[PDB]
Design a protein around this ligand. Structure first.
Ligand SMILES: Cc1cc2nc3c(=O)[nH]c(=O)nc-3n(C[C@H](O)[C@H](O)[C@H](O)COP(=O)(O)O)c2cc1C
Ligand SMILES: Cc1cc2nc3c(=O)[nH]c(=O)nc-3n(C[C@H](O)[C@H](O)[C@H](O)COP(=O)(O)O)c2cc1C
Lengths: 137, 137
């Protein structure tokens, strides 16, 4: 993989990062979570066991009609990365805007595909874009 | 570290991510790079060997008078994470705004400290904030 650094050290650096970091394995139309760090649990409010081993579309809830889904689905199919923002809902019920940075990865040894995502609450930048759009009009 | 996923797989997921990812080890007033991924090389334009094993303050160049430095230095000293934006300069000479998400990590076995950072070009959001500040005035 990379001769520069020990893999265990890199894994601990990821576990402790303040950014949410998840890894997902493709299974047909779905993509199933296999790794979440502590930062992700804090961003979502769901426990590690509560959230693992399912497509994390459940964070969308009933707000299923969002333009971000399609561009994510189209990029995943094309095997290209993407960066889209959706409106997610925490376990306690809070609503926020989540910027998803998804990168498709293909392990040729297994001939299946994985995905790594880095999430960040950008609800501030969203509310600043809405304010700017209002002033422009 | 984490029983969920193989560390080598996680390392390859990091090597291939579209986000820039670096790991740095503290050495006194400096903090020295030990890991960079391919996305970081593309964001900066410097090769992997050109950039490793030095404090990546060199990306600031002569533009050394930036408020981001101090808040990063104050957070690193306090052992708390931070998210600051600086004006960096590529190897070709391009100027952009880089959002740094730095998380201090302490390996008690070695009794030294590491840092993991995730970088992203947010020059678009910066230019949208300047435009909004102008319209507000
Ligand atoms: C690595 C990765 C991270 C993702 N992050 C979650 C998330 O934080 N919240 C969310 O709303 N969607 C998230 N998604 C997207 C959904 O899992 C889903 O795959 C996407 O919306 C497209 O498929 P769908 O149209 O079948 O829902 C993520 C997907 C991947 C691959
Ligand atoms: C993980 C990590 C990533 C960093 N990213 C670089 C970068 O992308 N560009 C930059 O201008 N500063 C970067 N820095 C900050 C500088 O390395 C430096 O440590 C910081 O500006 C504070 O110290 P100084 O005031 O002595 O320069 C990073 C620091 C760490 C720990």
């Amino acid at each position: 993989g990379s001769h520069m650094i020990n893999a265990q050290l890199l894994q601990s650096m990821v576990d402790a990062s303040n950014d949410g970091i998840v890894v997902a394995e493709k299974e047909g139309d779905d993509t199933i979570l296999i790794y979440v760090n502590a930062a992700f649990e804090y961003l979502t409010g769901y426990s590690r066991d509560e959230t693992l081993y399912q497509d994390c579309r459940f964070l969308q809830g009933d707000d299923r009609d969002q333009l971000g889904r399609a561009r994510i689905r189209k990029a995943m199919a094309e095997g290209r990365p993407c960066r889209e923002v959706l409106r997610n809902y925490r376990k306690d019920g809070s609503a926020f805007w989540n910027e998803l940075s998804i990168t498709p990865v293909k392990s040729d040894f297994d001939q299946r595909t994985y995905f790594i995502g880095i999430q960040k609450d950008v609800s501030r930048q969203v509310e600043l874009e809405r304010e700017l759009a209002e002033l422009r009009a």
